[model samples]
Target: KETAAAKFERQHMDSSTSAASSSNYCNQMMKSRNLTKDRCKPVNTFVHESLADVQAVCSQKNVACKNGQTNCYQSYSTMSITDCRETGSSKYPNCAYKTTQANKHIIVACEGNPYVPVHFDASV
Candidate 1:
């Protein structure tokens, strides 16, 4: 069984790529990563950095999560990433995505004993 921390990994980490690729990246990645199960996620961004480096974000600047939690933190360094955005005409079961690649500071919500990211907040 996978934990939320691992779920976060499954949802965002793509260290091996080192950079975003292909016009079809989001369409391919979102599904294979299990995010397009019941419905299409409207938006998501993936970080192309090692887990260790991403985890280090927990100790960086503090901020409130979108839901108003106080555990969120922003990355010290910007990372190259890919974003998958759903279009107005996009439908579920046949989810469609628009891909965009950029370098930005990652925002995450961390928790637990080891204090790792469990929720992806945004790319700032």
Candidate 2:
């Protein structure tokens, strides 16, 4: 016989493996007020694992970009952080002077044996 806490743990923990298999957290943003998904790009992502783990998956799918070729892994750190923009043009001078505010970081955890694919959604 299982107690209430034991039952809850069993139900939630038993399927933890399955949850990790299809788990992912993504951030979405827009360049313009009336823009569409065609232009929007993800800026950051968080996984329970490190960047290396995620890159392995990308390699298997043939989506691994050159270390300095494609634009990936902008900023990575163990501490939780928010994304910031630093412009290089005189017109769009300081990052502190940007028109739009960035979004907060989302937390993610990965689990499972076979490693499932996680889906990300972003739009403008």
Candidate 3:
């Protein structure tokens, strides 16, 4: 089995056509709301309870889903929140997300089948 690190590298190494397509979709949706497009941010649907549930719903025969998490410490982009702890700092404090947090996970729907994360909520 591939390690999570390996899977992550492979997934991010290239912008999957699905990712690009999704980005375009998100851009269009954002444009409707007069918002700027941020293709770098994964479009996710937040859910309550086992994030796996979100994965299940997002997955379809041709659609793949990925599980993602965000907290004071990290964004789905894997960027560090090192300055998250400073008082009044724009950075959020320690990981806002916890395994036991009320919100379970974010379901990410994409074009193709992507490797599921060990902690993924759901995926094709």
Candidate 4:
């Protein structure tokens, strides 16, 4: 089984592809990264920052998670991120997505002994 920390890194971390110039970025990435295996993820985010910077969010200001958990934290500085949203016309096995690059403060849920990010709660 994939650990929560590993899952987060797989789904959200993408330091190499920092600036997404093409609109088809999400379409290509979602498939290549195995996010389109069974079905398209309705919404997903890819952070174009160093793992250390992202991990530091655990020590940032505490915030409420979308699920009402209090273990979430918001990044103090704006970070480069790509928001991938499934297109309305998307169907299983042929998932489509809209990639939007932006600079925003990300919110994440931290957990476990090391207190690292486990979930990407949201971006603001």
lDDT of 1 by residue, 1-124 (tens): 9999998999999887977678888899999899899989889888899999999999999998999989999998898889899877789989989889999999999999799999899988
Q: Residue 89 in candidate 4 has what lDDT?
A: 98
Q: What TM-score goes with each of the models?
A: 0.93, 0.18, 0.20, 0.97
User: What is candidate 4's CA lDDT for residue 41?
Assistant: 89
Clashes of 3: 4
Comparison by TM-score, 1 against 4, better one: 4
lDDT of each: 0.90, 0.26, 0.27, 0.94
Q: CA shift at 69, candidate 3, in angstroms?
A: 19
How well is each residue in 1-124 modelled by candidate 4, as lDDT tens digits? 9999999999999989677889999998888889999888889999999999999999998999999999999999999999999988999989999999999999999999899999999999
Which residues of candidate 1, in runs, are more than 4 Å off? none
Q: Order of all candidates by TM-score, from best down to worst?
A: 4, 1, 3, 2
Candidate 1's error at 74, in angstroms? 0.8
Give stretches of model 2 more than 4 Å off: 1-49, 59-91, 97-124
The predictions' CA RMSDs to the true structure, in order, are 1.3, 17.1, 16.1, 0.8
lDDT for 40 (candidate 2): 29
lDDT of 3 by residue, 1-124 (tens): 8665343233322222212223233333323332223422232222222333323433423323233333111113221001101123212222121111121223333222443323223311
Residue 20 Cα positional deviation in candidate 1, in Å, after optimal superposition: 1.6
In model 4, the runs with Cα more than 4 Å from the true position are none
